[PDB]
Design a protein around this nucleic acid. Structure first.
Ligand SMILES: [Zn+2]
Lengths: 207, 71, 84, 50, 58, 118, 125, 49
RNA sequence: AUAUUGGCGAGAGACCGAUAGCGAACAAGUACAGUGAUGGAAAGAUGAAAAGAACUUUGAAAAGAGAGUGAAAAAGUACGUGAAAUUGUUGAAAGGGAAGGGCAUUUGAUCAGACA
RNA sequence: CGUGGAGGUCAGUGACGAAGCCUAGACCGUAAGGUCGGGUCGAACGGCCUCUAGUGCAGAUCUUGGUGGUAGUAGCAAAUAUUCAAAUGAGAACUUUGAAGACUGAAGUGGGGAAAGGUUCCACGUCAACAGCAGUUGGACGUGGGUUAGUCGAUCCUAAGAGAUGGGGAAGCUCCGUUUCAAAGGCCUGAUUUUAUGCAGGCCACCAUCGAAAGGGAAUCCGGUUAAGAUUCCGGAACCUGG
RNA sequence: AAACUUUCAACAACGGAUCUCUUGGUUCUCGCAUCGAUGAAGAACGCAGCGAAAUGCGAUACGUAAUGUGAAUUGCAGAAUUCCGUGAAUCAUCGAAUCUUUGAACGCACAUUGCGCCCCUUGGUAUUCCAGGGGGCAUGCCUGUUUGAGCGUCAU
């Protein structure tokens, strides 16, 4: 606050006492009157150069740099030695691109979509993402950041009929369209490679 | 208060703050059908008004104290 | 002296209780309260006493009526009985 | 003084009512942390200003 | 001529005069602990008479 | 312990005769309280007194309010207490007054609805 | 995950609305599941509690001890069950508080406006 | 203090500029506010452009 | 279209976690000082449930020692964990007007590699 | 090297005990500091790749809080002064009763008040704190009791003064002024009950209001009485005002 | 040689650091517009079966009535079927009521719980005196009704 420690009228006693020069809360009576205020070092004063609200919260990136980074991450997805080294269990997956048919876009029930992911090989990845539910460390866990999972595979449609309605609920699995391919979704935490499951209507749209 | 009762015929009431020695004398005349010749009020320091009403000789205070039921 | 032998003479009061604000602030030799000027109309409001505005501002006390207008707007200021 | 007004005797009734300990069954309540009575005063130490 | 004492109301509603002594002792101990810790602080910052004299010139 | 759902139906003199019984019974229950620790029964006498006194008051209120039905200035209490602003503002008619130029123009060339399609 | 901006997924805003709930909203917070007999008999998974039910304890050190709901205490968020008794050292007994999620109702105390509470939830008579 | 071979630059910050800044955190709040006022004005006037 | 550090209702945070954050997480603009304008604190954590110690004994009693509750009295309202300055006990050692420190080693204590 | 948070990863560690805390116990790093074993302890917490910052203390006559040495030391010395026996008591230089001894010495260490305090007044019970020693005692602690007015005061007057109105200043909060330059008010009779008045019918030309618990001022004394109340209650004997 | 001082470890103290916790605070965003002479904000006093505060409330006083939920509140004390119901509850909802003495403060005042006025009834023999009750009595200004003032001025 702008008066975070300035709601106290203090003024110093100069020099000629045996005490410090800091502004002291004059008056009398209660246990307060005689403390210091207005300083970064007094108990109950302002902080040093207090944190203001006009910082650089959002920062610009050149648009071609952003389309460069997204096109880099999409190319880093399709190497086996990157998504396996990122931390995803892509061991027993037959094809690194992992194109599925376009019938994934018409699935609607999560029971009928999780089996469709276990069939094409995410059975040792959804187990990885739901055997890894751990508690957040430290003071973050009472600021609505209480749990922490890993990331899972990302299925990318081209026109949805409830594929996002299917896989909103399962942990780790994310959805996206080919327009709005997110760098935050594609290289999460600045590490390249992400176990991306394309549907073929997306994989021929990506051309 | 119960030493003042049998000495004279002197009832001791706690009355309202807004009484003015006439509504006392008119309601204690009413609720008991007794006759009252002197009322002395004071403000006991709990914010209460205590009235030392003296019933007229023609009436005992102990008869009224046993008719009310506080003996 | 000017200290302890001149602190004994302090007996006659110069402030008495005010009838609008209720603190011992009603001056008697000129009849004017200092926490809100009583024979004047408006209360003594001030901008340099920014902490003093919090000691007597709205929302402080009971608000026997002003804590019902917020609820009474939300039902359209409606009248008539509740129901059956 | 002994020749007081009524504005003072209206207040000393509340000053005589607000001079007692906390009732003892308050501490036996469930979510009750009120150990002693803090606003309690007596005439030796803290003069009420009236 | 009383059937009412001090103790007659309070023996029914909660407290008992043996447990009242085990409550009255706890308040006077906690009044000590709240009056100790105020004198643990005010003795430091009380000699600051802001208009002193220092009565020795010549 | 009197109940309003059967207390509404009685007369006025019966309600006065009920209040001047409850006001005696409260006095006797406060006489008995001096020589007894606890008396929880007195609350159901005070709430019965209030339950009679609400019914009497809102009987007489309706007796006045129905007498003033449609008369031009009914009293300050029985008007609908809206805010201070809402009464000193205009009604729905005196806002909807328009002059005979604006009214004739607003019936001569008012708003039409349409689309954009060949 | 939620999909509204009416409801709040905040920890302070949830725990405050729990701990300062009114005594007519604590009724639906204190609920209990029914038995395998009662679920297939009515068709309700869980009802709000009501005093003088007949209940069974399924979690805690008093598991298996059936009893009768003596007084639901929705200020300490619990319910004292008869025949769930801690012997105090003074020779007296106290009933031990249970939380109603850890109970299971076996013989129910029916009533009107419970024979409506079942049928609005889709049960039998 | 005119220190080095740097451009002589004027900054209009003598005043109490701290009390009057408006950092627009609204920039994505009053866009979805505007794209609803272009829907209430699409439903209230029903077939008109 | 615009403004809004006030009131009302909401939703969130790469913010702070009780000497921080509003002065106030608590019966806070309260307790308290001043004639007065105004100034203005400290203070959250037993346990899952009080199951807060029945009973015996010493003592005038405060309490102690058993016994008991407890998963835990190394959780007994002075109640989570219990740091340091500071202090008692016992143990080790040393000491002719300071104590502490550096390099080397005797003696005394303790630790050790396995080369099983 | 380390600290508070944030994005990944270790499908990390953990009630079979996570952080923290202690250890002239061990190891690694020249160090910044890391790692292990033991005791206590009871619910969370690290490594690596990155991001971010209210991020590293011996000091600032530093701020808040705590505790030392000095130290069982300085001292607890004005106001003439205490002593014996008994009583309750666990206990008595200190409480009470008696017996002595004194002092204040009528401008009192007496009996009542005014300011101010506010329940301290008085009884019952009690000693953790306070009474700079003590304590069964107390102006402290807990709970209850107590203030009675036609006359004694305020209320009613006016002083020094304060302050609206008519007005006039002032952007204005408000300022001047107190009878001024206001059209400022109230009541007997023919009317006498239509009390409305037609005139009768006029009489200064006045004027808000506050301002003394010591000025002015209508009238009460005695004798009882209570744990505590008086010119107040009780008994008797008097008055003054309005009707 | 003990005592003593100093160093260390265990155990105990003083002390409240650290760790972990959080119904609070801060900042950002979104929506809505509602104080008051029908007496507001603010204040004094008072109200519970046993409360000194916080909260609530007005002589109808931790509250009344209506509506909804449908079996409690709880520290103790009490009513208990009012429990297949005109119905528990420190509940929620809130549209009808009271709303003490005040406060812009409104009959005149105020360091006073002071002092009159007018009407309607009640008692005291009672137009006048007293008392109880009920409702009235402020200024500035607007529109209108009524009553007047002015060789200002017109007609007769
Ligand atoms: Zn004031």
């Amino acid at each position: 606050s702008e008066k975070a420690g300035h709601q106290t009228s203090a003024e110093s006693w100069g020099t000629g006492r045996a005490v410090a020069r800091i502004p002291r809360v004059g008056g009398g009576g209660t246990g307060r009157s005689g403390q210091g205020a207005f300083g970064n070092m007094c108990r109950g004063g302002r902080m040093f150069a207090p944190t203001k609200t006009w910082r650089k919260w959002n920062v610009k990136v050149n648009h071609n740099e952003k389309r460069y980074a997204t096109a880099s991450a999409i190319a880093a997805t399709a190497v086996a030695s990157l998504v396996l080294a990122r931390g995803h269990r892509v061991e027993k997956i037959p094809e690194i691109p992992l194109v599925v048919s376009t019938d994934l876009e018409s699935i609607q029930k999560t029971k009928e979509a999780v089996a469709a992911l276990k069939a094409v090989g995410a059975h040792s990845d959804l187990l990885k993402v739901l055997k890894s539910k751990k508690l957040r460390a430290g003071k973050g866990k009472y600021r609505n950041r209480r749990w922490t999972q890993r990331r899972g595979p990302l299925v990318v449609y081209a026109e949805d009929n409830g594929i996002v309605k299917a896989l909103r609920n399962v942990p780790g699995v994310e959805t996206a369209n080919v327009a709005s391919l997110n760098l935050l979704q594609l290289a999460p935490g600045a590490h390249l490679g992400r176990f991306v499951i394309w549907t073929e209507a997306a994989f021929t749209k990506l051309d | 208060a119960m030493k003042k009762v049998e000495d004279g015929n002197i009832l001791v009431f706690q009355v309202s703050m807004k009484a003015n020695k006439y509504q006392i004398k008119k309601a204690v005349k009413e609720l008991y059908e007794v006759d009252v010749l002197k009322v002395n009020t004071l403000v006991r320091p709990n914010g209460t008004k205590k009235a030392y009403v003296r019933l007229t000789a023609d009436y005992d205070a102990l008869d009224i104290a046993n008719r009310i039921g506080y003996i | 002296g000017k200290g302890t032998p001149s602190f004994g003479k302090r007996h006659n009061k110069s402030h008495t209780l005010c009838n609008r604000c209720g603190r011992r602030s009603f001056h008697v030799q000129k009849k004017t309260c200092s926490s809100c000027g009583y024979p004047a109309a408006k209360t003594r409001s001030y901008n340099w006493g920014a902490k003093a505005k919090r000691r007597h501002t709205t929302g402080t006390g009971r608000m026997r009526y002003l804590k019902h207008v917020s609820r009474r707007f939300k039902n359209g200021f409606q009248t008539g009985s509740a129901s059956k | 003084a002994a020749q007081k007004s009524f504005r003072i005797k209206q207040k000393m009734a509340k000053a005589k009512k607000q001079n007692r300990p906390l009732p003892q069954w308050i501490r036996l309540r469930t979510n009750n942390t009120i150990r002693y009575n803090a606003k309690r005063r007596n005439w030796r130490r803290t003069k009420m200003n009236i | 001529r009383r059937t009412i004492t001090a103790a007659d109301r309070r023996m029914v509603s909660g407290v008992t005069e043996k447990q009242y002594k085990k409550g009255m002792k706890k308040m006077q101990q906690l009044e000590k602990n709240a009056i100790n810790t105020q004198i643990r602080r005010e003795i430091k910052r009380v000699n600051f008479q802001t208009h002193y004299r220092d009565e020795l010139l010549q | 312990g009197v109940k309003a759902y059967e207390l509404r139906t009685k007369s006025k003199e019966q309600l006065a005769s009920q209040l001047v019984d409850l006001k005696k019974e409260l006095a006797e229950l406060k006489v008995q309280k001096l020589s007894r620790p606890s008396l929880p029964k007195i609350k159901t006498v005070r709430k019965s007194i209030a339950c009679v006194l609400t019914v009497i008051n809102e009987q007489q209120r309706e007796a006045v309010r129905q007498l003033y039905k449609g008369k031009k200035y009914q009293p300050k209490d029985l008007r609908a207490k809206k805010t201070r602003a809402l009464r000193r503002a205009l009604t729905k008619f005196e806002a909807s007054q328009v002059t005979e130029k604006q009214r004739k123009k607003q019936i001569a060339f008012p708003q039409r609805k349409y689309a954009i399609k060949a | 995950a939620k999909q509204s901006l009416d409801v709040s997924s905040d920890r302070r805003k949830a725990r405050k609305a729990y701990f300062t709930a009114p005594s007519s909203q604590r009724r639906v917070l204190l609920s209990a599941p029914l038995s395998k007999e009662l679920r297939a008999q009515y068709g309700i998974k869980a009802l709000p509690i009501r005093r003088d039910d007949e209940v069974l304890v399924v979690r805690g050190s008093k598991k298996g001890q059936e009893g009768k709901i003596s007084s639901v205490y929705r200020l300490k968020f619990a319910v004292q069950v008869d025949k769930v008794t801690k012997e105090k050292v003074n020779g007296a007994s106290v009933p031990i508080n249970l939380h109603p999620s850890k109970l299971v109702i076996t013989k129910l105390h029916l009533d009107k406006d419970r024979k409506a509470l079942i049928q609005r939830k889709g049960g039998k008579l | 203090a005119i220190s080095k071979n740097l451009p002589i630059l004027k900054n209009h910050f003598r005043k109490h500029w701290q009390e009057r800044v408006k950092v627009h955190f609204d920039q994505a709040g009053k866009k979805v506010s505007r794209r609803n006022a272009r829907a209430t004005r699409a439903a209230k006037i029903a077939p008109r452009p």
